[PDB]
Amino acid sequence: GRCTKSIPPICFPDGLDNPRGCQIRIQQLNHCQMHLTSFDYKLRMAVENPKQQQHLSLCCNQLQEVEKQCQCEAIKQVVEQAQKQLQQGQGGQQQVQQMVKKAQMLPNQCNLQCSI
C-alpha cells in the first residue's frame, strides 16, 4: 500500500500510488523492447519519416494506460528486458545502444513523470 515518507511510516490498506513497485506488464513493452532492439528493415534513412514513429505512438499509448507515475517505470522495464534479451542472444547491446538510449528519452517524449 501507500506509505508516507516519515518514520514511523504510515501505510495505507490500498495503494493507487505505488511508484516504488510499479507493476507494468512486460508484455505490453514487447513493442518498445522490439522496436528498440530491432534495427528494422524499412529503416533506410531513419531520420525523419512519420511512419517510423508509429512504434512510439503504440508504446507511448500503451504505457500511458498504466499509472501516471508508473508510465516512466514501464520504460525501465523495457531497458532491463531489452538488454537481457540481446545479451542472451548474441550481443547487440553495443549496436542497439543507439536505439535503446531513446528509451531514456521516452519519459521526456511521452511526457512522463520522469527524465533520465
Automatic annotation (TrEMBL):
Q: What is the lineage of its organism?
A: Eukaryota, Viridiplantae, Streptophyta, Embryophyta, Tracheophyta
Question: Mind listing the GO molecular function terms for this protein?
Answer: nutrient reservoir activity
Which family is it part of? Answer: Belongs to the 2S seed storage albumins family.
Q: Could you tell me the keywords of this UniProt record? A: Seed storage protein, Signal, Storage protein
**What are the disulfide bonds?**
C3-C11, C22-C70, C32-C59, C60-C110, C72-C114
Superkingdom of this protein's organism: Eukaryota
Q: What is this protein called?
A: Preproalbumin PawS1
Residues of the Bifunctional inhibitor/plant lipid transfer protein/seed storage helical domain: 22-114
Organism of origin is: Helianthus annuus (Common sunflower)
Keyword flag Signal: yes
